[PDB]
Structure formats: C-alpha cells, structure tokens
Amino acid sequence: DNQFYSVEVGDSTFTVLKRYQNLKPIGSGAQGIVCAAYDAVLDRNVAIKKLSRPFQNQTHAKRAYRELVLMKCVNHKNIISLLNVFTPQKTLEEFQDVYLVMELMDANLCQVIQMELDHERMSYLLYQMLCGIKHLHSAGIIHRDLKPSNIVVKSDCTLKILDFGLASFMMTPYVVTRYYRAPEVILGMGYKENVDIWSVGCIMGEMVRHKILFPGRDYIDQWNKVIEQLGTPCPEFMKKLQPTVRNYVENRPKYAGLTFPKLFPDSLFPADSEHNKLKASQARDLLSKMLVIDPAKRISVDDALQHPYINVWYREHTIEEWKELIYKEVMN
Ligand SMILES: CNC(=O)CN1CCC(Nc2nccc(-c3cnc4ccccn34)n2)CC1
C-alpha cells in the first residue's frame, strides 16, 4: 500500500519512506529538523532533514532551492553528499514538505571544540576544511558563513561541510551566528575567495582557546572584539571602506595589536616533545596569517594548503512561484 508512514519525533510529524526506520532526533537547525535512521535498502545509517513549507518566504525559499540544487550537483569528499530527496505529497497542489536524506555524521565542530586535540587531528580536520572550501571556490561558490555548527565530522576524523553559504526579514524567533563572519562582510566592503579564510581562522583559534574568539551582541560589539585583540587595521584598509562606514571605524577608539604568541600562548598547545613544540609554532603561525583583518594581506586557500602545518596531508519570486520551482526540483 502506502509507500510511506508517519511517526511523531518531537512536535512535527516525520512522514518518510518505508526504507527509513527507527527515527531518532539528532538535531535541529534554522530551517529544518534532523533525524538519524536506518535505511533498510542500503543497510546503513543515514540522516534525514525535513523542510516544512520551504516556499513560505523568500528567505526559506531561496535557501532550500539553493541547497536542493547545489547539494545535488556539486560533489566532493569534504562536502556532505546527498543520498536521496523525497516528498510524501503526490501533486503540486498538495505539495508541502521536502525531506533531505544524507550520510550520517557523528558530530559538530562545536563538540570537537570542547576537547583538546593533537596536532595530527587538528591539522587534518583543518586540511579537509580547506579542501572543501577549495572545491567550493573552484565551483564559483564563496560560502561566507562557515561556522562550527555547519561543519560535521565522524569518529575517524573525517570532515564535511553542510550548507553552501549565503547567496531577508523573517518572523523567526531565533538569531543567526555572526561570530565567524569576515571583516568585509561585517562592514560590506565587497569580498573575494579568501573571505572564508577568516572563518576558518576563527574556528582554528577556538579549537585552541576553546572559546569564541570574537563574541558579541551585534556587529558593533563584534567589531570591537576584533580590534581589541588584533588591533585597529592599517590606514590603507579604511581607504577601501565606504565614506559612511569609514567614518564610524576611524572615529572608534584606536588600539594596539596584541601579538599572536600572546593571544595564543603555549599553555594551549602541546609541547611535551620537540615535535609538538615545533608543530605549536607552525600552528600559531598559520593563525596569524588567516586572522588578518585586511583581505589584501590575508593568506589565501591555496597558500594555507601549502603551509607546513597543513601540507603534511597534501531572483525575486513569489511564494507560489517558489513552491513550483522547489517541487519540480524535488521530482526531477
Ligand atoms: C554527537 N553529536 C551531537 O551532539 C550533534 N550531532 C550533529 C551531527 C549529527 N549528524 C548529522 N549528519 C548529517 C547531517 C546532519 C545535519 C544536517 N543539518 C543539520 C542541522 C542540525 C544538526 C545536524 N544536521 N547531522 C549527529 C548529532
């Protein structure tokens, strides 16, 4: 009979295909609830993400459609793969939810951040993170929103990126993380490939200090935290800032730049051997190359991949038009 079935997993009904059994709520994002399950057909575990009415508004629509196409086409070892996509509805009129099925990962970088790691693993995760971004950039995609919660890993240290970044008002009660956004983004100065290097850098630092590098209630408190530790950017940086934005920045209380050995002492890095001592200086070095405010003077993805610390692994549519676009994308 019916190719599906429904079980209650929280507060939203999950109506999925017979092949997926034993649903277990593993998490929730800002666009969909996620479940772990067993796929009788493939005989393996998978993750299922439900998107409720992804055509309700431009924001959710533009994102679900964007993901539905990219996660479909673009494929890389370091970018979560799509196993299948389906909808329990039978026609465009009835069309309601879209379910994304992907390989089941073990955890978030948030959980990895809450634990000390060796240089072997930290640099490996960092290596894969750069490969993914590399593939993304080559595919003409610049994430611009990389963060610990969007990067997943497994027990064997394999890493993969979840979403594909940005391309705006919502009644959504939950705020979005802004701690890992690059100076360019925070101040809308135009950007380029290396804008994601900043995100990476904020993440590598947090894996060291085990605390969010630049926290803040808004981009105001956010910028201060950046100039407090890295120091006011060089005058040549402001000449690239709009006359209105520059004003605000230049009229801000100047600061001195705390050296990197200070921001990241040795008590955070392992040095019980000559190997870890060296790896510490190399790790701290890369940080000072990524965590640079001025893009022009910030290391690129291909250079960071050459670093000795890493190279050791070498439109405007309506809610009705959107529903249409997304539906057909579902059913090829
Ligand atoms: C033990 N780990 C945790 O505490 C949380 N993790 C997060 C990753 C999850 N596994 C997984 N594998 C593949 C895709 C997604 C996933 C895809 N989108 C989201 C949004 C929120 C949370 C998870 N996801 N999640 C297992 C539980």
Q: Which fold has domain 107-314?
A: Transferase(Phosphotransferase); domain 1 (1.10.510)
Look at ligand 1, atom 25, and give the residue with the nearest C-alpha.
Answer: 105
Name the superfamily (CATH) of residues 4-106: Phosphorylase Kinase; domain 1 (3.30.200.20)
How far apart CA 136 and CA 71 sit, in angstroms, is 11
What token pair was written down for 323?
Answer: 């529903």
Dihedrals phi, psi of 164, to nearest 5 degrees: -120, 25
Distance, in Å, from the CA atom of 154 to the CA atom of 106, rounded to the nearest integer, reads 5
Place of tokens 């921001």: 263
Please give the C-alpha separations between residue 327 and each of 6, 12, 88, 237, in angstroms, as whole numbers.
21, 20, 12, 46
Residue written as tokens 């925070």? 186
Per the CB < 8 A criterion, the answer to whether 15 and 5 are in contact is yes
Same topology between domain 4-106 and domain 107-314: no
What are residue 38's DSSP bridge partners?
Answer: 21, 45
The CA distance from 267 to 265, in Å, is: 6
The residue contributing the CA closest to ligand 1 atom 11 is: 105
d(CA 3, CA 242): 57
Quick one: tokens of 68? 């539905």
Q: How far apart are CA 277 and CA 62, in angstroms?
A: 47
Nearest-CA neighbor of 193 among 72, 112, 45, 296?
Answer: 296
- Give the 3-state DSSP-derived string for the chain, with helices as H, strands as E and coil as C: CCCEEEEECCCCEEEEECCEEEEEEEEECCCCEEEEEEECCCCEEEEEEEEECCCCCHHHHHHHHHHHHHCCCCCECCECCEEEEECCCCCCCCCCEEEEEEECCCEEHHHHHCCCCCHHHHHHHHHHHHHHHHHHHHCCCCCCCCCHHHEEECCCCCEEECCCCCCCCCCCCCCCCCCCCCHHHHCCCCCCCCHHHHHHHHHHHHHHHCCCCCCCCCHHHHHHHHHHHCCCCCHHHHCCCCHHHHHHHHCCCCCCCCCHHHHCCCCCCCCCCHHHHHHHHHHHHHHHHHCCCCHHHCCCHHHHCCCCCCHHHCCCCCHHHHHHHHHHHHCC
Cα(208)–Cα(290) distance, integer angstroms: 14
Ligand 1 centroid from CA 154, angstroms:
10
Orientation of helix 195-209 relative to helix 274-290, angle to 10°: 140
Which residue in the block uniquely carries the two structure tokens 């995760």? 125
**Cα–chain center distance at 233:** 26
Is 145 among the catalytic positions? yes
The residue extents of the domains of the chain are 4-106, 107-314
What separation in Å is there between the alpha carbon of 177 and the centre of ligand 1?
A: 17
In a 10 Å sphere around its CB, with 0-12 CB exposed, 13-18 middle and 19+ buried, how is residue 122 labelled? Answer: buried
Residue in 26, 52, 162 to alter for ligand 1 test, most ligand atoms within 8 A of Cβ: 26
Q: Is 115 exposed, middle or buried (0-12, 13-18, 19+ CB in 10 A)?
A: exposed
Torsion of CA 132, 137, 143, 146, to 10 degrees: 40
Q: What angle do CA 303, 201, 80 make, to 5 degrees?
A: 85
What tokens were used for 232? 């006011």
